Structure 1
Amino acid sequence: EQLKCCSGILKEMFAKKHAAYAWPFYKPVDVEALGLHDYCDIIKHPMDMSTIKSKLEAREYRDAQEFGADVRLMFSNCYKYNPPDHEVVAMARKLQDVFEMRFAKM
């Protein structure tokens, strides 16, 4: 099953090797603590790694493509909300490189 391959992708994205850039994506953006009160006006469908992990464990993805769409949604939200020169955008790109290289191996 390619959903076993999806659990592997998440283990890689949560690994210590990538923590320096993956950490802002581990949990939902805490809009209240960060003062990002315009976030929900710009981002219609928030997504993060812990939510993807919960969805995967709860059989909410029919296949690897549905799983992949939520991972790409997480990165697209980051690219849409932040200015392009923001530190978090560079971090999203580094994490997206980890994901895309592993996802391509299926």
Structure 2
Amino acid sequence: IFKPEELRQALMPTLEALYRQDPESLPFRQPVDPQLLGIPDYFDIVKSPMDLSTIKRKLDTGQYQEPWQYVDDIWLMFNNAWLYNRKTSRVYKYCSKLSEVFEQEIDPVMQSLG
């Protein structure tokens, strides 16, 4: 059993560390808006959109029951970006950089919660 405040206290620093990567987090701070970006097939390819602001809101409002659900949303966000974009693209490279920041910080936190 994990209380929402316990999850917020433990996990919010890991999310904030991603936000503090600038410019790498900028594309991830807002939901992808295909109409703004001229990528009309986006929602045909990415079936379950996710972004940092959604994850933040879910942590803030206690929508995770256990911490691996938070990890799942983080990884879904990255998988969506790696899927839609080419390996040579800026957003793919930024995705990878954020994913490495996450990888390095997440286990000490998960180990403490478990």
TM range (shorter): over 0.9
Q: CA RMSD in A?
A: 1.1
Query: What does the per-residue CA deviation read over 1:4-27, in whole Å, with 9 as the maximum and x for residues that have no partner?
Result: 221111111112xx1121111001
Tell me the residue number matched to 1:44: 47
**Using the alignment, how far apart are the partners of 1:89 and 1:42 within structure 2?**
16
Percent identity reads 36
Gaps of 5+ in 2: 1-5, 110-114
Query: What does the per-residue CA deviation read over 1:84-105, in whole Å, with 9 as the maximum and x for residues that have no partner?
Result: 2111101000011111111111
Within the candidate set 1, 15, 23, 1:20 is matched to 23
Output the TM-score relative to the length of structure 2. 0.86
The answer on whether the counterparts of 1:26 and 1:49 sit within 8 Å (CA) in structure 2 is yes
Higher Cα radius of gyration: 2
The answer on whether the counterparts of 2:34 and 2:42 sit within 8 Å (CA) in structure 1 is yes
Structure 1's consecutive aligned runs of 4 or more residues displaced over 3 angstroms after TM superposition are none
**Using the alignment, how far apart are the partners of 1:13 and 1:6 within structure 2?**
12
Gaps of 5+ in 1: none
